[PDB]
Design a protein around this nucleic acid. Sequence first.
RNA 1: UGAAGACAUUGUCAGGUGGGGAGUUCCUUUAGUCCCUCGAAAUUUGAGGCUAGAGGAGAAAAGUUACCACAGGGAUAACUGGCUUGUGGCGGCCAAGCGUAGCGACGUCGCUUUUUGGAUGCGGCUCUUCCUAUCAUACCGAAGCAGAAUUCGGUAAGCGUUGGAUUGUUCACCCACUAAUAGGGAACGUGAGCUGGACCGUCGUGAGACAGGUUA
RNA 2: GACCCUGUUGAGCUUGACUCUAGUUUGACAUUGUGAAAAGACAUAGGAGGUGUAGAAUAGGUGGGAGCUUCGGCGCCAGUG
Lengths: 356, 177, 14, 156, 96
Amino acid sequence: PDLQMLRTRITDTIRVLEDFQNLAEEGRSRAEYTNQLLKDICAYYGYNEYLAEKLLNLFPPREAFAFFEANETPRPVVIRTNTLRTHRRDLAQALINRGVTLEPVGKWSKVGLQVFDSKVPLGATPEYLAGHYILQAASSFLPVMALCPQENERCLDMAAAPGGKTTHMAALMKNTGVIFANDPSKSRAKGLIGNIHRLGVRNTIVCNYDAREFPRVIGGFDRVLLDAPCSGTGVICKDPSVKTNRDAKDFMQLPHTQKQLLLAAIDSCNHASKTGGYIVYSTCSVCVEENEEVVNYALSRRPNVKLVETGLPFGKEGFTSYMGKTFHPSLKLTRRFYPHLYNVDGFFVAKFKKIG
Amino acid sequence: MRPLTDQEMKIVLDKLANYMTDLKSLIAPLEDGDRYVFRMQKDRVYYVKLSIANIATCVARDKLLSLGTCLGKMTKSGKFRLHITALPILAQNARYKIWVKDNGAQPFLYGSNIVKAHVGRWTEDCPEHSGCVVYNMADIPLGFGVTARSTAEARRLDPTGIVCFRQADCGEYLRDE
Amino acid sequence: SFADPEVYMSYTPR
Amino acid sequence: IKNKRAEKAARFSVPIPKVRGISEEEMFKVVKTGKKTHKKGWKRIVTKPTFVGPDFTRRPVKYERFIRPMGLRYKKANVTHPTLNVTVQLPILSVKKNPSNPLYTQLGVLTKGTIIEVNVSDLGIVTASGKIAWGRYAQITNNPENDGCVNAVLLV
Amino acid sequence: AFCKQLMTLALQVPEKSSQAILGLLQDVVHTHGRKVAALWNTEERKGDGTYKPLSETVEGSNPFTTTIWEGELLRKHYCPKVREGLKAMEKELRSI
RNA sequence: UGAAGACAUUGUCAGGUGGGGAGUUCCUUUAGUCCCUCGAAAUUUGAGGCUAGAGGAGAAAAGUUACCACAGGGAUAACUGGCUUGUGGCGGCCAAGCGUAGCGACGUCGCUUUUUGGAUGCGGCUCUUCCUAUCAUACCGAAGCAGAAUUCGGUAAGCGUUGGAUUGUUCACCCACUAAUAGGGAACGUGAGCUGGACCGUCGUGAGACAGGUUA
RNA sequence: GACCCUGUUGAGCUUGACUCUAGUUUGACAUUGUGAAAAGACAUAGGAGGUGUAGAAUAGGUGGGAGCUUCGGCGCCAGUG
């Protein structure tokens, strides 16, 4: 039908839901109004009923509208400067002299810059070719800041296929220590090794493993990062398949794998660590079935681990309760990011300390 | 993974000494009683910490894909060739080094040979076919190669004349993407 | 209006 | 399909750093300025229409001297769905098999009867599991070298 | 590397020897400058490696991964002469 | 007899890797009973388990490629010559027929394609003659062609048929005259005239160099 | 110009048995005592608590329950879940 008419119906329905008690109909109910909104938004934004209903259930009407706008809108171009090669000011000065529009992403990061437009390809700059910066997203900035690594540590990245998080870790460990970068994909492991060598990381071990096998393989890591595979509900702009290709069986399969991966990470980290016993669970999904369900599972089936403060600038507290499921009260510490609040992909981070 | 044999070590060190001055610096022990060793996975040589090699021993041979810094590949005929991945170590210990301007740095990054029209600084007393690491005007390690002529010949050479032969450049990171 | 005034990444300079 | 495209491109379009790399002709001219002695016939131009994908890519030395011009590159094809009888313009995702030459299918040469990967998202094809297809096989069934357009029939 | 070790020596040598070393570094910073300004600006400190004081080789000791901190002790050194020596050296560092 | 110190060192099991030493000749997919275990969610799933097909003499090296570089060999050695011009390609529907499913024109529909108005990387000038695919001049047919000025088309080669700007040159556009300031051929040498390298040798080869020699 | 092949080289792909084991490496336990100072989990007896969205409202959860009595306010029923 007419997409302008569909949007007009969406706006009218949001207003009706805002002022249902005052502005209503003769006998039509709030359930009917929400059904009209759901059908309209599925027909306009090209979502399926299942995922659209989860997103509408998670957000209030107006905030849901903003969330869907943000999902339809491409996120900004951000570059992480390599501390192992240069620093932000010199890199920005060189890129500005080369003809690109650069400025710091904010006060939360000291090692990142935003590009407003360019005159030359940013992947073709001599600085990039020498490994002075990497094209990366703020959502991937956050997990390393949560798992700030120290020098001379042994760390395990359980899904490091792109390589940005691994290179961030090695920059903060100042090319000291050992990093175990794992990928289940060899074709993407090619690009991972390429980024590692371009950015100049000498403390890495690239392995092709299912991440559930690490307590068997080596285990005992000082710090563990788990960017779990997920639905991709926070990266809808980059992968528009999520809108119509995520249903009940998928949302049952993925969380089970996430549970097993988090349990493997917990078992692979060690308790008696002289410098850190931290596991960071991370994902780019906003769905509850993929968020804080895994954390409640972890806290309920290994009591030898506890949630700690993320030490992280921004975000909202996680959901202590939801549609019937009551969670462990500590999940308010886990923090959550949305594209419309913060112009960063929908993201979720959680920090664990082992105690036994 | 396995250590290098005597002939393999001799060949690798021959190339590395062709491009560098000090190599006891590369094999020298460090403060924590650790040293850099040489490893071979498939047909590629890897410059690694001994501690990293020992801790990576637990990884299966068919599932280990990288380790430390990839220094090059041993060819089918038993000949070692360096890589832009091996550029950094050449940068710490380069014997001969040649600087180029931006108008020659971009061509080199595209995969061309250095020209004295691109050169902006020389290394004094450089033999005809030696080992020169190519930098830009910001001392940024850009590549490596063998120069075509001596310093005097390059100075008296035509401004449009080949001075260095390209073997590796930083644009191969856009190959393996 | 759902935009944190301190650290929301803008699309345009400044 | 066109109305959906117009809505998205008219009211979900936002300023984004949008640039492109240089062409292989420019790269070849630069490396030739770098290399004086021109071996005779070192440049063979691919004179057939091609699909590439990315813009500033560095090719392996195996193929580094194959030059595919901008005038011959193609990005979209007129793809016909037979059962849902309709032809739409769709982007080309990849080149799967040129039945004339493995070198052609490596280079992305588009000839008659050539299997390519096409984005079929706009069609809204529902799969058996209930999902929307994001890529299908389509056979080029015209002579793109003689016709300044690429015509494909979708194998569904 | 020599600048860093010479600052340590200037901390730990008699007054006139210290003043001599400090003047030598004054002249070194005047002559070279930008090559060693990163040793005093901490935001240009290199992040690839850790400084190794007890190194066997000059290159083995990563000198650009540390910062010149010796001023906060040599400024309260008891010798007015070395005090204006630091003052002039820092003046050149600022006037680079 | 003295020093350090409940840390080292050491030992036992469970495992990971093992291109090294000694000895000998496991996972993945397919179909099935809805037969069993583990994990998850509660009103259903994932991984294993079973039946039997398909994948993975042995650290010396081996196989392979319409790919690259060098060297070499074989074939081919010019090429168009009742050639060329104004109307796209692809898929569906219709379709006299041929045929007894297959080939199928003219149309029509879908894509290219829509609801508000620089390209180019041998050129230029003079003269002879010819062609018409005619810019002008002559005569006609049609057009809301009132008049004037025109537009499209037809017969016509009798007679005439530029300059400027810009550009490396040309064209387009744009600007001045002018009745108008058309396009081409002279036949693989675009009528006549004028003007604006490859062989050897040596040294290297991740690659070239030689006031080295010879040669049409 | 271009096509096919051969040799050497480069780039890429595949193969290169099985069983123990050196080496290397992860985890658990043991020698092994005396104290002191903190931390976590077990033992009770108590005290205080539960704010995603919508809902009047800060809804641990489950159970019965149509009527509850400091005898006037509540229920139920309506919503909203």
